[PDB]
Amino acid sequence: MISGILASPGIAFGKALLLKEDEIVIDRKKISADQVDQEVERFLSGRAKASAQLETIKTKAGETFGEEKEAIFEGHIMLLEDEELEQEIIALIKDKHMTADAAAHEVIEGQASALEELDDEYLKERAADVRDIGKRLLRNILGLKIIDLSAIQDEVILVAADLTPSETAQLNLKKVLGFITDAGGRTSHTSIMARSLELPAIVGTGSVTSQVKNDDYLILDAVNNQVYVNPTNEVIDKMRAVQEQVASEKAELAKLKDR
């Protein structure tokens, strides 16, 4: 009975791939002028790695979708390499004795909310895309593990509350049979993927991410705008026939030539 917004029509079968992430905890402890020099190395050297990582994804966005998305990712790297935001973050660590994670979050707190004050679809979405840049940097400063979604081996369904352009830019379209998230759907980047790839998809799942586990067996109908959770074999066999009966009914159109 989960009715979404239906992004593309079609039927697919696959296990539920839930993406779980550990929340990041920021330490608000004040350091002494003795550890300050160390935070600069983790931030300066940290950007050295994040710059190399984001730089690689940039080409993945242009080689996967085309030079049209490379311009959006090209601007993001410019922000991180902004010599202005760098002098500020450093000033907060030495002027406010803040940690690299804490000082970095402060600047990112206003860079995102500021873009939200603009009434533009690009500058607004830039607000959400900018928050993703600081979130990554935070995981590199603490050395948190990164989830490699491009390392899948079994074709399954992708389920997530939402995916950010970067993650979508590196996602593997050959191992994913469809996308099902809890996004509004209007300006959802995922939806735009479904239209260009025409693959079946849904976004108005509401809270399916709070009622499904990984490996759950789900059937995407994308026809009557409905998803089945833990269906009985009797139902499966019933859908495997009709569903495939559609593909055969389509090939039957090729028979309207013999008529």
CATH of residue 42:
1.10.274.10
Verify that 170 and 124 share a domain, yes or no.
no
Query: Which one of 76, 97, 105, 189 is the catalytic residue?
Result: 189
Q: Measured in whole angstroms, how far is the alpha carbon of residue 238 from the centre of its chain?
A: 34
Structural domain of residue 130, as residue ranges?
Answer: 21-146
Is 97 tagged catalytic? Answer: no
Indicate which CATH number applies to the domain containing 225: 3.50.30.10
End-to-end CA distance of the chain: give it in Å, rounded.
41
**Cα–Cα distance, 38 to 100 (Å, whole number):** 9
Verify that 33 and 9 share a domain, yes or no.
no
Verify that 124 and 30 share a domain, yes or no.
yes
Q: Measured in whole angstroms, how far is the alpha carbon of residue 130 from the centre of its chain?
A: 13
> Of 234, 209, 238, 239, nearest to 222 (Cα)?
239
Verify that 117 and 69 share a domain, yes or no.
yes
The dihedral sign for the CA sequence 193, 194, 197, 199: positive
| Structure letter (DSSP) for residue 225 | S
Q: What strands, in cross-sheet order, belong to the sheet with 176-181?
A: 201-202, 176-181, 156-160, 12-18, 217-220, 227-229
Helix-helix angle 100-116:33-64, to 10 degrees: 50
Is residue 256 assigned to a domain? Answer: no
218 φ, ψ (degrees, to nearest 5):
-125, 150
**Cα–Cα distance, 155 to 7 (Å, whole number):** 20
Q: Give the end of a domain, one of 146, 172, 201.
A: 146
**Cα–Cα distance, 77 to 244 (Å, whole number):** 46
Q: Which amino acid is at 153?
A: Q
Q: Which amino acid is at 43?
A: F
Q: Measured in whole angstroms, how far is the alpha carbon of residue 132 from the centre of its chain?
A: 9
**Cα–Cα distance, 245 to 204 (Å, whole number):** 28
Is residue 255 assigned to a domain? Answer: no
184 φ, ψ (degrees, to nearest 5):
-50, -45
- CB-count exposure of residue 60 (10 Å: 0-12, 13-18, 19+): middle
**Cα–Cα distance, 161 to 159 (Å, whole number):** 7
Q: How was this structure determined?
A: NMR
Verify that 38 and 138 share a domain, yes or no.
yes
| Structure letter (DSSP) for residue 51 | H
Instruction: Decide: 23 and 135 in contact? Cβ < 8 Å.
Output: no
Cα Rg of the chain (Å, integer): 22
Is residue 155 assigned to a domain? Answer: yes
Instruction: Decide: 2 and 227 in contact? Cβ < 8 Å.
Output: yes
Cα atoms found within 13 Å of the Cα of residue 47, Cβ hemisphere only: 19
Verify that 37 and 115 share a domain, yes or no.
yes
Verify that 115 and 86 share a domain, yes or no.
yes
- How many domains does one find in the chain? 2
Write the CA distances from 99 to 39, 172, 216, 217, integer angstroms.
7, 36, 41, 44
Q: Measured in whole angstroms, how far is the alpha carbon of residue 176 from the centre of its chain?
A: 13
Buried b (16+ CB within 10 A) or exposed e, 62-81: beebeeebbebbeebbebbe
Verify that 242 and 155 share a domain, yes or no.
yes
**Encoded tokens for 71:** 């311009």
Q: Give the end of a domain, one of 111, 131, 146.
A: 146
